[PDB]
Amino acid sequence: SNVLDGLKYAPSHEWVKHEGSVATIGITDHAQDHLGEVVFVELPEPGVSVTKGKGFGAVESVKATSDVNSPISGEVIEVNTGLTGKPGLINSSPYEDGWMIKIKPTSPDELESLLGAKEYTKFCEEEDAAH
Amino acid sequence: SNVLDGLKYAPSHEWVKHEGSVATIGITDHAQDHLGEVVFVELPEPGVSVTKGKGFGAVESVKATSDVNSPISGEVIEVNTGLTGKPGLINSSPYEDGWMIKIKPTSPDELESLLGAKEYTKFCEEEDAAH
Numbered sequence: 429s430n431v432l433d434g435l436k437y438a439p440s441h442e443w444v445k446h447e448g449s450v451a452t453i454g455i456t457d458h459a460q461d462h463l464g465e466v467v468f469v470e471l472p473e474p475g476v477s478v479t480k481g482k483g484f485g486a487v488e489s490v491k492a493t494s495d496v497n498s499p500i501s502g503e504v505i506e507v508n509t510g511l512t513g514k515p516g517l518i519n520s521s522p523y524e525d526g527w528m529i530k531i532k533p534t535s536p537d538e539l540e541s542l543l544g545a546k547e548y549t550k551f552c553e554e555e556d557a558a559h
Numbered sequence: 560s561n562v563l564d565g566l567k568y569a570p571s572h573e574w575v576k577h578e579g580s581v582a583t584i585g586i587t588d589h590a591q592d593h594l595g596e597v598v599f600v601e602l603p604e605p606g607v608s609v610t611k612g613k614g615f616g617a618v619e620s621v622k623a624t625s626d627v628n629s630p631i632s633g634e635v636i637e638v639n640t641g642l643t644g645k646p647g648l649i650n651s652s653p654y655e656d657g658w659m660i661k662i663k664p665t666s667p668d669e670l671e672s673l674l675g676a677k678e679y680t681k682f683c684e685e686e687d688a689a690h
Contacts (some may be wrong), residue, residue, distance in 0.1 A: 467571055470612065481598070483613055486571060491593050492625035516690060526618045530615045554567045 430457045431549050432523055436542035438499040439551060442522065446539060450505065454527045455496060455518060457554050463489040465520040469511045471528060476504045478531065480538050485528065487518060500538045502531035503512060560588035562610060563654055564682050567583040567673035569630040570682060576656065579671060585658045586618065586649055589683050594620040602638045602659060603674045609635060609662060611669050616659065617648060633662035 435443040441459035445452045456474060462464060468488040478484040478498035486495045508527050518526040533539070543551060566574045572590035576583045591597065600618040609615040616627045630660035640661050642648060648657040664670075674682060 465690075467690075470570065475631070486612070486628065488571060492623040493628060495626045495628065 429461065429525075429552070431545050431552075433545050435523070436499065436539055436544065437548035437551075438542060440496065440497050440499075442496060442499045443474075444542065446533070446536075449504065449532060449546050450529045451500060451533050451539075452500060452527045453529050453531065454490070454522055456548075457522045458495075458528075460522050463487065463492070465490050466515045469480060469515045469518065471511070471527070472504050474504055476478045477534075478502055478529070480485065480503060480535075488515075497517055498531075499542060500531070500533055501535050502533045504529050505532055506530040519541045560592050561618075561654070561684070562588070562676050562683075564676050566654070567630065567670055567681040568676070569628065570675060571628045572591065573630050575628060575630045575670065575673060577664070577667070579580075580663055581582070581661050582664050583635070583658045583661050584630065586588045586627060586653055587679075589655050591650045591653050592626075594618065594625060595622040596620055600642045600646050600649065600659070602642065603635050604635060605635050607635045609633060609660070609664070618646075621638070627659065630673055631662070631667075633663040635660055635662055637661040643645065 435445050437443050441456045443456050465487050466487055470486040472484050481497050482496040484498045487505045505531055510516055566576055570572050572587045574587055597618050597620045601617045603615050610632045614626040615629050618625050639658055
């Protein structure tokens with residue numbers, strides 16, 4: 429439940445940090461907290477294209493596999509190789525050290541369609557209250 | 560958990576039995592163990608292609624929902640319809656009657672990136688160890 433003020437969010441609980449012509453993607457604090465302990469991460473290869481709403485990789489917790497969808501379209505230029513040996517950084521640092529991939533955005537106005545922090549907070553409240 | 564000897568395994572805990580030009584896919588004993596009693600299984604249609612690393616279905620247990628990812632690429636030629644009426648066959652028979660789909664392999668050499676039984680047994684040990 430920590431939500432950061434300067435990121436863009438997808439309903440499936442991924443964040444995007446757009447700085448200039450690159451965008452960094454990871455999963456949110458709400459996502460890691462609900463998956464439980466993350467024990468493995470599967471990432472794409474550099475030079476690969478990802479597409480808005482299609483899966484690019486997977487996070488595995490002690491109980492389950494969760495496929496992660498790209499929040500925007502682009503070409504992977506950098507992959508967090510530190511996560512393979514330290515998958516736990518997703519639980520400890522989802523917004524900083526737990527980043528997963530860096531992309532060159534090919535259709536940057538897809539960022540218009542993403543939820544901002546307040547909208548993502550209300551969304552998580554609604555989703556958790558369907559309980 | 561049992562690990563069978565002639566099978567290949569993906570890190571997301573699916574197995575592959577390749578026989579002739581058919582490959583049968585399911586979830587491992589370790590996977591069903593950690594998931595708990597399976598109560599619902601979502602499976603593709605015959606005719607659909609699956610891609611290595613991409614989800615083709617999902618298992619829903621009493622405790623977690625888990626995406627099921629294809630270990631290799633191919634076209635779905637048969638799905639286990641028995642699984643809709645008896646989802647618990649994944650818990651009782653993960654390697655035989657609980658099979659989920661059969662595919663025709665598109666690139667048989669993807670099998671060479673999968674884990675053999677010994678490596679998989681060890682991988683499961685890291686995962687389950689306190690970190």
